[PDB]
Design a binder for this molecule. Structure first.
Ligand code: K
Ligand code: K
Ligand code: K
Ligand code: K
Ligand code: K
Ligand code: K
Ligand code: K
Ligand code: K
Ligand code: K
Ligand code: K
Ligand code: K
Ligand code: K
Ligand code: K
Ligand code: K
Ligand code: K
Ligand code: K
Ligand code: K
Ligand code: K
Ligand code: K
Ligand code: K
Ligand code: K
Ligand code: K
Ligand code: K
Ligand code: K
Ligand code: K
Ligand code: K
Ligand code: K
Ligand code: K
Ligand code: K
Ligand code: K
Ligand code: K
Ligand code: K
Ligand code: K
Ligand code: K
Ligand code: K
Ligand code: K
Ligand code: K
Ligand code: K
Ligand code: K
Ligand code: K
Ligand code: K
Ligand code: K
Ligand code: K
Ligand code: K
Ligand code: K
Ligand code: K
Ligand code: K
Ligand code: K
Ligand code: K
Ligand code: K
Ligand code: K
Ligand code: K
Ligand code: K
Ligand code: K
Ligand code: K
Ligand code: K
Ligand code: K
Ligand code: K
Ligand code: MG
Ligand code: MG
Ligand code: MG
Ligand code: MG
Ligand code: MG
Ligand code: MG
Ligand code: MG
Lengths: 194, 82, 97, 99, 212
RNA sequence: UCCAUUGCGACAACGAGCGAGACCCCGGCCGCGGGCCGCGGGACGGCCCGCAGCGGGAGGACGGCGGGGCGAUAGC
RNA sequence: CGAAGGCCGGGGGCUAGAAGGCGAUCAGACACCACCGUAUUCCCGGCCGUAAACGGUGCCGCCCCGCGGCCGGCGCGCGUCCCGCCGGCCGCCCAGGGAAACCGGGAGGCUCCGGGCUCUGGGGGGAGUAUGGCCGCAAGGCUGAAACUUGAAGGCAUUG
């Protein structure tokens, strides 16, 4: 309920006036001016499911976190800071999963992107070397080569920061690192871009 | 089981994996197939070790993007959602 | 000679025949949905003399009359006078004005 | 001359990041700190260094960088007092939870 | 000696990985050719040069001549491979082509025409393939039948290990690289097709996987 | 943008090399040494103005150093 | 039934304008450009039956990832909008197809080939010609060979 209040302050529940057929299951109503609204319960269930997918991997440094959007850059360096995932902040360089001579080349087991139209090169390249992917998806998202969507508002900084903060909290809960049923010492403000 | 001899010996070189969503054989050279696994907590919000649940999805279903629906359906019916 | 454009070089959708317009430069006969068309609005005196006319008028509150003329050319004249340019194969798909 | 080759520029970067302290915005002094197998080559690389210094003034700009992106202020930035969910999120929260 | 540059090639180095059927079960690419040579030591793999073509690049000061070559490999008992290479000199062209032919190895499914008495001796079922304007059909045959093919196709079917077989070809099969590509794709499709022998469902155990 | 595939910056490409430049020779101004010859210094788009760099001024022997040598791949 | 041109018999005659005439240009210019001009262009009653008559794509019927735009009719909604349904016209496009260009409302569901029906083609020339027939006032149209000759012709695409 407290996290619901936080989701309401960040407005993580508002879409972008267009709807795809595969996101139709996550919609609840439509605002008059055309904006769509997500069912927040479904959003939380996708967050929990993604957390339960992340913890199967023994070493977290082989999870890739890719986010080209400036408004998310800060938020992705903190998700790693408490989970020990591997961040690819800026322009994704072609070849990073397919070309072994590259200096930042790697062979991860999960790709976690922020947006499916930004960061398209990572999503397309991961389909050549057997990586599944999880994406933060808005109402107009195209789910090609994506296995788990997360319905959410992926433009405003508060939304993005709170989303990565929730994900990292539930992962640290599931692994046993931080205690269950108790507010994390980390304020979500550390994830939002100033 | 695989193809068999006249006596009972399975004379099949190897057994390809089937898609968990479409029942299709995976086959080698298909570098768009993804096999991934899930926690199965069973203990008050913490996972336990070496007890997972695994599924397969071929490039044919990924290419158009039916996993976000099919894998949710599968996990609901294996007791991972509702 | 394969096909160069999906629209075959004109905008004719669901009909058999469209009207004829003469080209203004050379007076060639061109079908209306193929002719290159533009609309111009311009004063009848140059702006380098519109100030002198406006000072030397007598009518208090007088304004400069405008002009509204639709120019229509054929493809040859349009390319020759540079109303339209030959473009790259990629660029040909752009409809931005 | 006018344009400097990438040999010169590649040099100038490592040189200035290695002697940020020693370099002033003049040329005579910067020569010493560059003092390369030729003296005209020396002259050109030092010419670019003398510009990089008065361009970086307007490391010492990276130590505070890691101290700035960590400070979490005493407030919370979401300490909201009043709900504004009166429209479609109203029925959304009715059909999820308490209200 | 040789040094891995990929994680799978590192797992090759230890006694970790045993055979190709697991690497094909979990269908990963194979990026180094000594990965192959670890499993296939010292001339279990046969290696044949089908063709050297000379290709020309027209230029302001005359033409520019290079070499393309195509090469086949196979262990006579269930693996086939086809590669090509382009270079300034014939030796290097062939060397590239052979290396690519060995990173392009696939298994092949074989079965029983008619009676299932002995070992699989012909294609498991009909196979079809296509490359360019060429299309190929491989049809199962009874024992003693042989390899009814053209000299180009028969050589690939010999390296793969398919004793008896009827073949059919349509399109411009004088285009040799497309002919060999069609036959290659036909042999590669052998392990994609559901047959009642494999219908049955199973439990996936994350332990067994080789962690991509 | 520059004399210049010279560079800035952007990009299914990432990372190197040659040619260019650098280099050699001569000639301007100044020092130590020898008795002019032979060893070094000096000049850099450095200074101050206006908008990777195009402009205007200043000082200096010389202002964007000047005349030459060498010279990619492919060839007729 | 059938664009335009053309033909027969009546009418009309502004514009433009095959033919014809004339000024330039030019080596020549009987052409392009300038000027004058007859049929024709318009109407009434007929005839002729062809066009890159083109989406170079026959007609009926089924299935088909998606995102838009416009046009006609209908219905539910809130307070003109908004969501749908049927029919039409269009753009972009996953898969699949293909020699490719591209198609994709098919040019898909096809060497894994079989829903129904009608028409046409079989290397390049000679030739749509000769000959016979039917139609037409004519101009034509429709039907349409043989001897003989030839190693290519041609499609889409790459570098110069
Ligand atoms: K792919
Ligand atoms: K053509
Ligand atoms: K046209
Ligand atoms: K229309
Ligand atoms: K129309
Ligand atoms: K019309
Ligand atoms: K126009
Ligand atoms: K024209
Ligand atoms: K580029
Ligand atoms: K480019
Ligand atoms: K490209
Ligand atoms: K001396
Ligand atoms: K001397
Ligand atoms: K008629
Ligand atoms: K008619
Ligand atoms: K007519
Ligand atoms: K007439
Ligand atoms: K008249
Ligand atoms: K006429
Ligand atoms: K003439
Ligand atoms: K002429
Ligand atoms: K006249
Ligand atoms: K006439
Ligand atoms: K008349
Ligand atoms: K006429
Ligand atoms: K008339
Ligand atoms: K007629
Ligand atoms: K016709
Ligand atoms: K025709
Ligand atoms: K047409
Ligand atoms: K028909
Ligand atoms: K309408
Ligand atoms: K309408
Ligand atoms: K209508
Ligand atoms: K309407
Ligand atoms: K309507
Ligand atoms: K409508
Ligand atoms: K409809
Ligand atoms: K319809
Ligand atoms: K209609
Ligand atoms: K359309
Ligand atoms: K239509
Ligand atoms: K029928
Ligand atoms: K017909
Ligand atoms: K026909
Ligand atoms: K026909
Ligand atoms: K015909
Ligand atoms: K026929
Ligand atoms: K005759
Ligand atoms: K007659
Ligand atoms: K007549
Ligand atoms: K006659
Ligand atoms: K006649
Ligand atoms: K041709
Ligand atoms: K032709
Ligand atoms: K032709
Ligand atoms: K082509
Ligand atoms: K061709
Ligand atoms: Mg007249
Ligand atoms: Mg007249
Ligand atoms: Mg007429
Ligand atoms: Mg026609
Ligand atoms: Mg329309
Ligand atoms: Mg006759
Ligand atoms: Mg071609």
């Amino acid at each position: 309920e407290a996290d619901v209040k936080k989701m309401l302050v960040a407005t993580t529940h508002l879409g972008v006036r267009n709807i795809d057929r595969r996101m139709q299951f996550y919609i609840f109503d439509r605002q008059k001016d055309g904006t769509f609204v997500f069912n927040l319960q479904k959003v939380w269930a996708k967050i929990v499911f993604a957390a339960r997918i992340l913890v199967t991997i023994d070493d977290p440094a082989e999870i890739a976190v890719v986010a080209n959007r400036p408004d998310a850059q800060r938020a992705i360096l903190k998700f790693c800071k408490y989970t020990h995932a591997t961040a690819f902040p800026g322009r994704f360089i072609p070849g990073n999963f397919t070309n072994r001579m590259n200096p930042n080349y790697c062979e991860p087991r999960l790709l976690l992107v922020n947006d499916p139209v930004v960061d398209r090169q990572a999503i397309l390249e991961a389909s050549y070397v057997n990586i599944p992917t999880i994406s933060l998806c808005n109402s107009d998202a195209n789910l090609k080569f994506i296995d788990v969507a997360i319905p959410c508002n992926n433009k405003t900084p508060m939304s993005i920061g709170l989303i990565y903060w929730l994900l990292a909290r539930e992962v640290l809960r599931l692994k046993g690192s931080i205690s269950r049923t108790e507010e994390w010492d980390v304020k979500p403000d550390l994830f939002v871009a100033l | 089981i695989g193809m068999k001899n006249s006596s009972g010996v399975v004379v099949d070189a190897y057994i390809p994996r089937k898609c968990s969503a479409t029942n299709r054989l995976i086959g080698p050279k298909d570098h768009a197939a993804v096999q991934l696994s899930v926690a199965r907590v069973n203990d008050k919000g913490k996972m336990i070790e070496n007890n997972y649940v695994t599924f397969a999805f071929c490039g044919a279903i990924r290419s158009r993007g039916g996993v976000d629906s099919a894998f949710m359906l599968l996990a609901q019916e294996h007791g991972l959602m509702e | 000679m394969p096909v160069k454009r999906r629209n075959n070089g004109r905008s004719k959708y669901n009909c058999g025949h469209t009207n004829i317009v003469r080209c203004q430069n050379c007076h060639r006969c061109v079908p209306k949905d193929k002719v290159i068309k533009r609309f111009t609005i311009r004063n009848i005196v140059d702006n380098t003399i519109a100030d002198d006319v406006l000072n030397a008028c007598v009518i208090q509150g007088f304004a400069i009359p405008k002009l509204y003329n639709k120019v229509q050319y054929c493809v040859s004249c349009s390319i020759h006078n540079h109303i339209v340019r030959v473009r790259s194969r990629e660029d040909r798909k752009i409809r931005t004005p | 001359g006018k344009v400097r080759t990438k040999t010169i520029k590649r040099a100038a970067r490592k040189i200035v990041e290695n002697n940020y302290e020693s370099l002033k915005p003049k040329d005579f002094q910067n020569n010493k700190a560059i003092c390369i197998p030729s003296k005209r080559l020396r002259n050109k690389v030092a010419g670019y260094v003398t510009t990089l210094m008065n361009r970086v003034v307007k490391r010492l700009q990276e130590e505070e960088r890691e101290r700035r992106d960590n400070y979490a202020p005493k407030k919370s930035e979401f300490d909201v007092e009043n709900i504004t969910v009166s429209g479609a999120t109203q029925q959304m929260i009715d059909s999820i939870g308490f209200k | 000696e040789w040094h891995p540059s990929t994680k799978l090639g590192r797992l090759v180095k230890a006694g970790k990985i045993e055979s190709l059927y697991d690497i094909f079960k979990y269908s990963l690419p194979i990026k180094e050719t000594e990965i192959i040579d670890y499993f296939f030591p010292k001339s279990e793999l046969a290696e044949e040069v089908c063709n050297i073509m000379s290709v020309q690049k027209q230029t302001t000061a005359g033409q520019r001549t290079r070499f393309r070559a195509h090469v086949i490999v196979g262990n006579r008992d269930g693996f086939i491979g086809y590669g090509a290479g382009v270079s300034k000199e014939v030796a290097n062209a062939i060397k590239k082509a052979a290396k690519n032919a060995r990173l392009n190895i696939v298994p092949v499914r074989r079965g029983f025409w008619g009676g299932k008495l002995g070992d699989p001796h012909t294609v498991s079922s009909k196979l079809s393939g296509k490359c360019g304007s060429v299309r190929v059909r491989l049809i199962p045959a009874p024992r003693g039948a042989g390899i009814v093919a053209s000299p180009t196709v028969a050589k690939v079917l010999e390296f793969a290990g398919v004793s008896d077989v009827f073949t059919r070809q349509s399109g411009h099969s004088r285009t040799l690289m497309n002919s060999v590509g069609a036959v290659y794709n036909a042999l590669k499709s052998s392990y994609s097709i559901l047959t009642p022998d494999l219908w049955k469902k199973e439990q996936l155990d994350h332990v067994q996987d080789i962690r991509t």
